[PDB]
Design a protein around this ligand. Structure first.
Ligand SMILES: Cc1ncc(C[n+]2c(C(=O)O)sc(CCOP(=O)(O)OP(=O)([O-])O)c2C)c(N)n1
Ligand SMILES: [Mg+2]
Ligand SMILES: [Mg+2]
Ligand SMILES: [Mg+2]
Ligand code: NA
Lengths: 394, 314, 309, 394, 313, 290
């Protein structure tokens, strides 16, 4: 398709346009706002026919698309930062009612530190809600994930909402080359939304009746089984996306120079691209370093990680977040990667790096200091403290 | 176009709220649901923000609505309704459904309409969605065990406002009057009315008149709660009527800046004739009652109820 | 593994009552005898059936007792599965309610009633492992107390045992001797009423008698997202006919067919027919609203146990 | 002092009464409501002098006590279930402004649909917010944690809010024996609340300005340091609470029959007391089984767990929650315990048991089956799947 | 008690909102804050729900208030102030502070007052806290880059309501009138007024009248935004005056069910004399302007402005 | 350390300073013109607006940036150009009170849109440090937008791209070439010119700060001025209309009438616009030394 140099915001909007979304609900918060601004223009200029609902806030945004998804509309909304936490109540009702709502999150820190830049903290607060979730690291991937998450989420085997996440500023604003698909491609990839229940007076259903505790375990387990089936469907979607669009995504891990790497940095989102640039430079110096970027955060690829990343001497885990009080005092990725690789805990050394707090750039130098810590850990086979908060501690 | 109902004789026989629900014997909100469902007919979608008319009606894994129904958070009834309306408009316009545009009705408790659900209500009216928003008002957070809400009358005993020597009246605060709150400042708002299960035909007619508007409508329905207000299960209708006869609740339509009173009364009974029949007020002293009377007098004057207050022989 | 976790010295009391109008007294019976037993160094636990909450007017609700000499190891449960003492705060509960499910041999059934022991037994049918039936006219001795206090685990501002809970519990002690009548007297607000219950309570020994769903099926029964189809004429998920302490009886010679009753029934239990109003006894809760609004005197309320059916 | 048979709700209210709280903000939701009903009676009867503010919802509750704490009041509020998630936006502002708000959480399964039964899912959604957090398993401990958490949280080295959690119904409603402290004990234990900032026109301060981009990482790290300082203060508080009240709590782990145990079950809250009873009975059969009840969830006792729990052949982790999509498909406790014990992963077998879903009882028989599974794991040295969802899978 | 101000020359000299803040040149809300602070005096606590008057004023790690101030979420301005008031009430009663009871003032933007902050505002009025809640209305979510709010006029161009062939007017919805929404049904409400920076002594007097009441007050203040409305930085006061002179904004006090009009003249200017100076209305056709006029006429009739509409020239 | 390890030798940094809201397109159109002309020569380029300066405010000094390299750019994420080779000013007053020469690398070129002499400009600048050239262009007359003439002056002095390549991308080539030949270029004698631990110690408890007493030194706004208010006290009646309408509290009442605080005044011109007596006049800021 047409190749354009565009922001992640505008890339997401084209994905939403191509998916022919039926109901959108807007509200402003930096840095995701531009997504809705572009969609508002697209509706005003007739490039997309959708009901464009001015939500009174983020809680309402999610509530509006809850209602619309139950009435059979394909729906889109999004937010950032404290907007993500303000809408928290509604995430579980959406998932538990099996409504494949898509919500874009362009990351913004919570309050405090406030309105400047990104942390993954906001979206990671949602990691229990029963949603598909992953981070785009480029504007192109931002568009592609929009389409892929609609296809996987709305598949009648799944019927689960999705968080299509992208780094604030670093993906949402920074321009990048994006191959925009054409309508014929998307129509072959993305069938129209069809749920197993819908609000329709011709076929009346009662959606969400109160249950007693004894009904709790069956229904929770039912959703669990839906969650556990996502990976298979996502593999199929990634195969079809490669076939139809010509871009081949790994469903779980974007690996770079891991073939004979002895240490890698593991993490997600845009800062991993910076990690790759550092890795290549260190490789030219003869360092056997590599990078594994997590493409799919929920459901977590426990077994795929166990299988594909247990061959390294040391893994440094980047958490661009402030997950306070968590086991091992890094962030969430460190705890979940260790849980995944637990059987290899004696051989595969792991350590967490917390950096990019408050939207700071994770710089080439900081990554250098990360790879150099891993090099040391690999040689001695010992980890001194389970986390380093950069740049205060490393 | 839903037609005027002339009388009980000419009321629809059809029930769209059927037997079988874990509501109290004598439940006023249950009767409200029955009458609203009866007036609305089959081309209707209900939205149920968490409260008795959600929990009591669907306990457990079932429900009494013949028409579609969906659960809403108590925080977001108005927004869920906005989405369903928007979805139907878009789906019909984009030709992805052959369904006709339905009645769309929120059944919010007083908490979910005047307190925690107010913001979502106001926004729905602002956006002008073709939705009827009903408040069924039992004057407490009832399903949680009878706790004070903004519609709970001055002086009422609830588990959050127990009478005691530091707070003799139990509840010190006078109630928010939600039908007047939302009646102003929302240009899209087509119709506002108050109703009561005591006057079922009046109620059903207001529901239909609200539905007939092309745009948002708000109906606030008085629904006595024998459990919460502590009166016998077979006194619910008498309580409803006495609420209006004492002016504790006013029945009207508010259209184009004017109040049109729905029920003619030549005399207004003193509020004590109403309050004495409910144990939620049993702790109150004469001076407390007099404060209630003054409040009600002002409330009545506000809507043009100018008749004298006259003690009954009974 | 039921035997491995058996508590041989543990007795289970299940108290049935009518929601809202008798829930406080059921709780007080339950609070009374555990407060009494605890004065004798026993291990005790009082709770209300949480699943029965919130209580609704006339729905059958429950309160439970577990008193023990050995520390209680079955605390964090919702209900007594195998009762040794079943108490009925209201008499109509012998109709349409599983009040004898799981009772253990040598059990006692105490009934708040003014009717004969024979009559109650006429309704119960097979009493299984029940060994004692006890009647006590608690409504002659004290009142059924109603309060907004004491709900959802909160302390009761009216205290314990001012109402019919006192004489009922007194009859329990007469039945089982589960605690000393003096210790019960110490923990109730109305020892007099209790003492009349203890003194005036008829006991009869019953004639000699001889004595679950899997996880797979549970899940199999749960529909997609818990969503269900709208009912067509009735909601069989909640059949409410067994809430009745009374029912509406019509004299059709007096009926005007004004259908005032019909328009005010909260439970859609009246239908207009060419025979006049027809009252749905599968669901009718006996609220009495129809009787209260009838202008002709065609309708009256009659106690549920004046009927065999 | 006086011993009474009271619910966890009333126990908490006595703790609040004894702490002489200045501002309380109420709102109803089963099963925590009884806490506010008792406090309301206490206020109306003159047993406690406090502003009793009728919140319009849980977001408001947390916002009211945020404001009151900044004005120098000791504050209290609480909730359950979707009330916890509705107030989500406010937790980070409270922590980040170092206001030692205490929130009581009586757990309840999140929507959908409506379900009054408990899961720890609700409070676990808050695990990143920078709060002190732990589960009481009895009404006595519910009272005691109320006092301890005010002590620790209000300490001028800490100044962090606290979630005093207790199992819904099982602790909140079911009556238990409670030794109620008298005023003199509390006065010796709990100093008056004094923060480093306060709204006072005589000494004007600007609380929460927009900080410059470069100051994000130091503000985050500053709070991280405060979080990392909590444990030492909690250890001191437990020591003083033993001396003053005569009840000695472990700051981290409530251990039962672990000295010679080959396998243990690890978890938190009321259901762990059931686990103890099952363990005692199995000991009669000859089984060397034990129980470790986690008393402090945040900040997580990583190194304390690593040190004290690494001596077992197998650990079964109970998660009474639905943390969907999490690494290893158990719940949060399995992931964080494995992260803490990572170094011993070749030797210390771990598996997750998910039960008590939707408020269902975790039965003696279900604990029997968990212990039987751990015995097999200890014998075989094999974990075949990392989690079992009871009763569907085990 | 805070005294009535008779004139500009007799206005207070003291500034409690001082030079130094990252607000636009000509910023209407900045002037609003200055005048409110001047009127309120030193025994005052400010609550700032997220928006320009928070972000622009505290950039970075500082602030222009001589009195104490605290950040609130845009969602909870009313609730945060409720808690500050409850605290002072309790602390004073329980003899744990010797501080005097302060002026407590919320400075919410229109987003934070009429849209996402409304529920918390209404609740604060219901509970009857002694708090002055102010909305500074710049008729958009401004700090986020100018997006439609419910006070955004019909036909206004914002990044969420751009004009286009499908939606020619840009914004099709007419605004919510928040001072009338909260003026009814709240028994504890002591005082409601609308103000404008065009009439700065009137503004400060209304603030003082609000503060003087023992209980809740709401003042809705028109504060033109040259960035968001697109007009020159030195026309902010002209814009404010024209808003009132055309009836696009009504100035009054509402008490005992009656409207006391603050500025009473013999004529009203056509709305076009106001709209044509702002590029946020540049796209509108005559039929759109006529819709605005009919709306404004209805709004003026509502408060009893019955003078004829007369072109200036 | 890793200076040379991740160094980008072939990369040129361009910083364009403007007045917020009113000229934030002049700034952007300049960085777009130069990069579209460089991407024509086969260079790797990036052009963006300073996220740090958002949201922009009327007259606040804001920045647009350009990166031009013959190698792929690996510093894409970096918010700001820290070491600019070319500093470009859209409005002349920006030569006063603004750190436009911070981080400048040797061989750098300062371009200014102005009619004033280079000598006058240098008086305002003072120590230009590593600055090699100082360039003046009267783009305002050439736009009579100004992006093209200013872009022309940039090329003429630096030769970072070709004239015709810029001509193919500018919206007005005529005004571009005019000023490419009229830009007065002048070479200078180009002489030479905070730990995380320190950052941490600087951050107060919870970020809370004391209230100011008379002024907020955290945000000094005098350098926003394009113009300042000048009073004629022979016309002034001391009515203090100006005083009560200043949104920045920059006017004080005295015995001699209103006094204007130039440390903070933003030159919004409201005081001038509200004066009943016409005693105030807006006057260009560079007309004054202080
Ligand atoms: C729950 C929530 N949602 C969005 C924002 C973002 N946000 C801002 C931010 O993050 O700094 S500033 C702003 C604008 C609010 O508009 P209004 O209340 O009208 O004030 P003003 O900016 O003065 O127009 C918004 C909307 C937020 N902070 N919190
Ligand atoms: Mg209610
Ligand atoms: Mg309609
Ligand atoms: Mg605004
Ligand atoms: Na006041």
């Amino acid at each position: 398709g047409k190749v354009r140099n565009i922001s992640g915001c505008v890339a997401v909007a084209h994905g939403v346009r191509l998916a022919d979304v039926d109901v959108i609900c807007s509200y402003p918060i930096r840095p995701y706002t531009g997504i809705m601004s572009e969609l508002a223009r697209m509706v005003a200029d007739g490039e997309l026919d959708a009901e464009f609902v001015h939500g009174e806030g983020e809680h309402a945004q999610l509530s509006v698309v809850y209602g619309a998804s139950a009435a059979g509309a394909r729906v889109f909304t999004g937010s950032s930062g404290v907007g993500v936490t303000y809408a928290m109540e509604v995430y579980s009702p959406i998932s538990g009612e099996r409504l494949p709502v898509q919500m874009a999150i362009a990351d913004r820190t919570l309050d405090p530190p406030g309105d400047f830049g990104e942390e993954h903290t906001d979206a990671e607060c949602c990691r229990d809600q029963g949603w598909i979730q992953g981070w785009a690291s480029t504007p192109q991937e931002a568009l592609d994930n929009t389409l892929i998450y609609y296809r996987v989420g709305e598949d009648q085997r799944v019927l689960l909402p999705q968080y299509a996440c992208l780094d604030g500023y670093f993906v949402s604003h920074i321009l990048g080359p994006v191959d925009i698909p054409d309508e014929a491609q998307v129509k072959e990839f993305l069938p129209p939304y069809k749920n197993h229940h819908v609000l329709d007076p011709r076929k009346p259903q009662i959606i969400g009746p109160q249950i007693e505790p004894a009904m709790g375990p069956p229904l929770q387990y039912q959703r669990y089984q839906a969650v556990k089936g996502v990976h298979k469907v996502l593999e199929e979607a990634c195969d079809e996306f490669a076939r139809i669009f010509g871009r081949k995504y790994d469903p779980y891990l974007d690996e770079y120079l891991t073939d004979d790497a002895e240490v890698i940095i593991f993490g997600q989102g845009a800062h991993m691209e910076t990690a790759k640039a550092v890795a290549r430079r260190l490789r030219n110096l003869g360092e056997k370093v590599g990078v594994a970027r997590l493409r799919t955060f929920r459901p977590f690829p426990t077994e795929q990680i166990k299988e594909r990343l247990s061959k390294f001497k040391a893994i440094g885990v980047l958490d661009v977040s402030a997950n306070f009080g968590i086991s091992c005092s890094g962030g969430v990725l460190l705890s979940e990667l260790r849980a995944a690789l637990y059987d290899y805990g004696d051989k595969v050394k792991t350590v967490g790096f917390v950096a990019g707090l408050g939207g700071e750039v994770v710089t080439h130098d900081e990554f250098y200091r990360m790879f150099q810590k891993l090099k040391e850990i690999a040689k001695t086979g010992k980890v001194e403290q389970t986390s380093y908060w950069i740049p205060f501690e490393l | 176009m839903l037609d005027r109902i002339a009388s009980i004789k000419k009321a629809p026989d059809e029930e769209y709220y059927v037997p079988g629900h874990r509501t109290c014997a004598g439940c006023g909100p249950a009767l409200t649901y029955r009458l609203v469902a009866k007036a609305a007919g089959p081309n209707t979608i209900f939205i149920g923000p968490t409260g008795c008319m959600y929990v009591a009606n669907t306990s457990y894994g079932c429900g009494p609505w013949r028409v579609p129904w969906i659960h809403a958070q108590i925080t977001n009834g108005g927004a869920v309704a906005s989405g369903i309306e928007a979805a139907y408009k878009a789906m019909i316009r984009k030709k992805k459904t052959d369904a006709e545009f339905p009645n769309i009705i929120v059944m919010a408790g007083d908490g979910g309409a005047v307190d925690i659900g107010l913001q979502a209500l106001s926004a729905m009216l602002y956006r002008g969605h073709d939705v009827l928003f009903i408040c069924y008002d039992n004057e407490s957070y009832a399903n949680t065990g009878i706790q004070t809400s903004p519609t709970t009358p001055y002086g009422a005993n609830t588990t959050f406002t127990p009478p005691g020597e530091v707070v003799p009246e139990g509840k010190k605060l006078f109630p928010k009057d939600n039908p007047k709150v939302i009646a102003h400042g929302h240009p899209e708002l087509k119709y506002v009315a108050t109703a009561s299960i005591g006057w079922p035909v009046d109620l059903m007619n207001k529901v239909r008149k609200g539905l007939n508007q092309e745009g948002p409508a708000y109906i606030h329905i008085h629904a006595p709660c024998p459990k919460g207000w502590q009166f016998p299960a077979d006194k619910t209708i008498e309580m409803a009527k006495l609420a209006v006869q004492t002016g504790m609740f006013q029945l009207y339509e508010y259209e184009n800046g004017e109040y049109k009173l729905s029920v003619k009364v030549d005399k207004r009974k003193p509020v004590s004739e109403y309050m004495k029949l409910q144990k939620r007020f049993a702790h109150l002293k004469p001076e407390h009652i007099a404060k209630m009377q003054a409040f009600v007098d002002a409330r009545c004057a506000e809507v043009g109820i100018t008749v004298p207050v006259v003690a009954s022989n009974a | 593994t039921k035997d491995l976790f058996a508590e041989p010295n543990l007795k289970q009391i299940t108290v049935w009552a009518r929601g809202v109008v008798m829930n406080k007294d059921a709780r007080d019976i339950v609070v009374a005898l555990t407060e009494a037993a605890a004065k004798e160094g026993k291990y005790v636990q009082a709770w209300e059936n949480y699943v029965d909450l919130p209580d609704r007017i006339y729905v059958p609700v429950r309160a439970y007792a577990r008193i023990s000499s050995d520390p209680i190891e079955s605390k964090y449960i919702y209900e007594n599965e195998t009762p040794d003492i079943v108490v009925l705060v209201e008499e109509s509960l012998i109709k349409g309610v599983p009040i004898l499910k799981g009772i253990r041999p040598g059990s006692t059934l105490v009934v708040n009633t003014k009717r004969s022991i024979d009559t109650i037994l006429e309704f119960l049918g097979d009493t299984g492992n029940l060994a004692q039936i006890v009647t006590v006219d608690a409504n002659s001795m004290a009142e059924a107390v109603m309060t907004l206090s004491g709900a959802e685990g909160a302390t009761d501002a009216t205290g314990i045992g001012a109402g019919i809970a006192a004489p009922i519990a007194g009859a329990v002690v007469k039945a089982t001797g589960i605690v000393d009548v003096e210790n019960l007297a110490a923990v109730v607000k109305n020892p007099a009423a209790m003492r009349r219950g203890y003194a005036e309570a008829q006991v009869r020994q019953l004639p000699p008698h001889e004595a679950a769903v899997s996880a797979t099926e549970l899940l199999r029964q749960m529909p997609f997202a818990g969503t269900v189809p709208s009912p067509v004429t009735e909601n069989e998920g909640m059949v409410t006919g067994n809430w009745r302490i009374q029912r509406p009886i019509i004299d059709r010679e007096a009926c005007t067919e004004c259908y005032t009753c019909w328009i005010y029934c909260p439970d859609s239990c009246i239908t207009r027919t060419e025979e006049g109003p027809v009252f749905n006894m599968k669901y009718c809760k006996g609220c009495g609203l129809c009787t209260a609004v009838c202008p002709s005197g065609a309708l009256t309320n009659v106690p549920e146990l004046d009927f065999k059916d």
